[PDB]
Structure 1
Amino acid sequence: ATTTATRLTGWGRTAPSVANVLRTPDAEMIVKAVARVAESGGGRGAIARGLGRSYGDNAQNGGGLVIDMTPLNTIHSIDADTKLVDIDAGVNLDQLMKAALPFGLWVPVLPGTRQVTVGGAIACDIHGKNHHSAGSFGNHVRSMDLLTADGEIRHLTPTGEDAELFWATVGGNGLTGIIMRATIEMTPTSTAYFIADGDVTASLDETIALHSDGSEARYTYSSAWFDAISAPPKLGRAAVSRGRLATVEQLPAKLRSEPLKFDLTLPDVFPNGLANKYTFGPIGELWYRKSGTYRGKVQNLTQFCHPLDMFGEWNRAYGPAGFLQYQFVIPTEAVDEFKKIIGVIQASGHYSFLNVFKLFGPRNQAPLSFPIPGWNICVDFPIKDGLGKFVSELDRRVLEFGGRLYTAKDSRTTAETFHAMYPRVDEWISVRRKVDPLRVFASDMARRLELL
């Protein structure tokens, strides 16, 4: 065990605050610190911290305690018959994925990076490429052990007594207490590969049409890269990547002897950089269209889920240092309003190169869960004069159109905007006050967003 004064930021490397960081692989030492925060006064409290991949301020607590959960990383059991994994909250999804593949089990929700803790995944109720077919992370938790303000460990499940606290903890940003341990139901798989279809659209209207033609129901996974810089009609054109997990019959013979195995970058070889005389004219368009259009292509995890790994030190000049990540969802029916927000973005003078578009499916019952059925987009803006004031206008537009921002990608929204975006906030706050009357759990985010 060590306790250290530490300057913490989120992944965006902004809004720094100093906290006493506790780092111990001893679960009883964690209980004792919480018990101490609870007994001695009220104070500025405590917040859990995972791998620090949230862009915002939800895993810091200026002048209070931060409990680093990463050394609690025991996988206790995996069972192929029940499909259940029992894991400490500090286990990460990369570690879990590799540990579970030999059992023919797949992590049911994967984010854009595997460097996230199980606790972080639950507390942000993370989503991925299969949201429309599988929901978000919290949908797959069968039990969790929550260390609450009174220093007891409550065993929470999604149904029966304490369901309310379970669903307040899902997406609760650590503010109901410290998840120590959890059971996740995994997805059975016979391979570590995807079968994928690719389509490339010419415009925004084409991108939308493809996502509302009914074809989404044929694919368990689906996401798109999105042009946010070009003027219409090119604005909102997309490289759409859709697929499902392959079965072993669908693999080529060379891969069929290790169906479950998990298997030198572009800036090193074919760089610097990628452009030629063709790239920005009609041949480049044709090439782009033809290489992004395919059917029944076998891909590994890296190809299908982390296609940004191909580019190397190039993903350093697109974040995170002088960059502001911004993610929002607009309800399905507000299609015209979605197109309107995209127009506002391209004409703003703020140029976002990397844009992830996805159509979300049904929501779950967590009051603070980000995803709702509708048009989800993530953008990444260079930090520049006027950006802060422009994203405030974006906030207003998102709110007006019935949508919301993601707390994992936010450090600059107001309490007022957030509360209007999350109309079940009062219901959630009221659960939080029942389980933490003394405000033992607190973070910079809780104070900024008035969730304390």
Structure 2
Amino acid sequence: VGATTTATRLTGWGRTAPSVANVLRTPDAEMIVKAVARVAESGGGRGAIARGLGRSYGDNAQNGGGLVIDMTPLNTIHSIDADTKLVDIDAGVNLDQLMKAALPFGLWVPVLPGTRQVTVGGAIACDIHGKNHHSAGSFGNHVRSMDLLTADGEIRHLTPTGEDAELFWATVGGNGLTGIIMRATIEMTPTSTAYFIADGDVTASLDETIALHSDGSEARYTYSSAWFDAISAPPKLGRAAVSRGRLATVEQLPAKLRSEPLKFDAPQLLTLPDVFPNGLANKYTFGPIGELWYRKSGTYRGKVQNLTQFYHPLDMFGEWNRAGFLQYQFVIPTEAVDEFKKIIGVIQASGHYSFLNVFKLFGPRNQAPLSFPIPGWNICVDFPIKDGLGKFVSELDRRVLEFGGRLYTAKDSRTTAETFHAMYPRVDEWISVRRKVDPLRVFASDMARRLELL
């Protein structure tokens, strides 16, 4: 329970670009206020940045030669209310913790990323998105208030629509550069079960994948995402396994599950690598029977699924996934469909092979100037680090930029300031807010300096 300050070598989830910071770790809020006051009174040096669970791949949660404040000990859930749907929680609370605590109230975390190991602070600061972006927006859309420790040492109560709305919306997606989010109130989504009813589809090509997302069917599902093929030559290029669904109601559950509709079942002992150590391939896998088999297994209607089944389907693959990788995620505006296809073609012909590829059509954006999601074609790819990759991804940056798209700060450790600023045309507007709230650069990070956000 005691406060500690420790020189620590930090990296994001990508394990790249390490830098040494003094890491403060304390469950005492007043100690965090005092540390920020100390940096502020210092009138120099390299400032401070908050750090959550370190799930961002890049360098936004580290500060070489400065202070890093580990927020994970501030993890109190203050209250949950089923009538108002509000949760009041410290910024260090993580989404898995929150999901579990809130389920007995018939409340659902309104935006969940592909991993549950992210803090509320990290969720706000990266304005995270999920499988339901097109129906629910991003994390920032659901924050009703937050308490922000600013450079002047004061704790400001921010609301999306109040007098401090400008600062609220600069903090959403602000990558911790407006101050330290101490605490927040989130509006949860009501639910009668912890289950999904899901429809699966399998497409044969990129053209089919795009048509499926463009035919109006997306409006029938609150949740929608896809795995796609980024390695095969066209026309197989861009074929996808698509998973779409909505939260189930109690009466849609089979009789055996209806007695505990809000139950989160425990992740089981055995994963697929444990049961099939020699892999899943047989003599049929890559020919026409394999094709039919995968088509059939991935095509279904009204299937009842728990959270892991529906939302974390890679979990069953255990140690096989991510077997020195560069995570690259971008969105291209909806209208730019040919441009989007062109970029997918570029990736396939590049000689860089990504096996893990998520595809999603984002919905409307929010008013946060630095928010990543815009309506359009969102893709994540995972490239093994090898010769030529750095220069190739710089070419990808140019294409993404030229086609009106952007990269996501939570995934980036290598784009340039020039590129990033052009991708985010409201960056100057955001920088102006940051300069008002932090004239002395009390808040600073490796990303802030790299991307000239400092």
| TM-score, reference length from structure 1 | 0.99
Structure 1 unmatched runs, 5+: none
Deviation at 1:314? 1.1
Deviation at 1:430? 0.1
SS in 1 for 2:174: coil
Q: What is the distance in 1 between the residues matched to 2:42 and 2:151?
A: 12
Q: What is the distance in 1 between the residues matched to 2:334 and 2:42?
A: 49
SS in 1 for 2:208: helix
Deviation at 1:70? 0.1
Q: What is the distance in 2 between the residues matched to 1:412 and 1:276?
A: 39
Q: What is the distance in 1 between the residues matched to 2:276 and 2:302?
A: 27
Deviation at 1:40? 1.3
Instruction: Select which of 138, 141, 163 maps to 2:140.
Output: 138
**Match of residue 20 from structure 1:** 22
**Match of residue 51 from structure 1:** 53
Q: What is the distance in 2 between the residues matched to 1:165 and 1:210?
A: 39
**Match of residue 121 from structure 2:** 119
Q: What is the distance in 1 between the residues matched to 2:334 and 2:227?
A: 19
Deviation digits for residues 107-153 of structure 1 (CA, Å, limit 9, x no counterpart): 00000000000000000000000000000000000000000000000
Deviation digits for residues 415-442 of structure 1 (CA, Å, limit 9, x no counterpart): 0000000000000000000000000000
Q: What is the distance in 1 between the residues matched to 2:263 and 2:124?
A: 27
Deviation digits for residues 293-319 of structure 1 (CA, Å, limit 9, x no counterpart): 000000000001111110111124xxx
The more displaced of 262-271 and 238-247 is: 262-271
Q: What is the distance in 1 between the residues matched to 2:43 and 2:426?
A: 30
Q: What is the distance in 2 between the residues matched to 1:40 and 1:188?
A: 47
SS in 1 for 2:283: coil
Instruction: Select which of 237, 242, 245 maps to 2:244.
Output: 242
Q: What is the distance in 1 between the residues matched to 2:274 and 2:336?
A: 44
Deviation digits for residues 12-67 of structure 1 (CA, Å, limit 9, x no counterpart): 00000000000000000000000000001221000000000000000000000000
SS in 1 for 2:321: helix
Q: What is the distance in 1 between the residues matched to 2:435 and 2:87?
A: 31
Deviation digits for residues 330-366 of structure 1 (CA, Å, limit 9, x no counterpart): 0000000000000000000000000000000000000
Deviation at 1:271? 2.4
Which residues in structure 2 correspond to 1:397-436 (within 5 Å)?
397-436=399-438
Q: What is the distance in 1 between the residues matched to 2:167 and 2:176?
A: 12
Deviation at 1:103? 0.1
SS in 2 for 1:132: helix
**Match of residue 183 from structure 2:** 181
Q: What is the distance in 2 between the residues matched to 1:292 and 1:354?
A: 17
| TM-score, reference length from structure 2 | 0.98
Deviation at 1:6? 0.1
Q: What is the distance in 2 between the residues matched to 1:283 and 1:248?
A: 38
Q: What is the distance in 1 between the residues matched to 2:184 and 2:162?
A: 17
Which residues in structure 2 correspond to 1:245-284 (within 5 Å)?
245-263=247-265, 264-284=270-290
| Number of residue pairs aligned between Structure 1 and Structure 2 | 448
Q: What is the distance in 2 between the residues matched to 1:314 and 1:351?
A: 16
Deviation digits for residues 155-177 of structure 1 (CA, Å, limit 9, x no counterpart): 00000201000000000000000
Deviation digits for residues 372-421 of structure 1 (CA, Å, limit 9, x no counterpart): 00000000000000000000000000000000000000000000000000
Structure 2 unmatched runs, 5+: none
SS in 1 for 2:328: strand
Deviation digits for residues 87-108 of structure 1 (CA, Å, limit 9, x no counterpart): 0000000000000000000000
SS in 1 for 2:421: helix
Deviation at 1:270? 2.3
Q: What is the distance in 2 between the residues matched to 1:366 and 1:331?
A: 17
Which 4+ residue blocks in structure 1 deviate beyond 6 angstroms?
Answer: none
CA RMSD of superposed structures (Å): 0.6
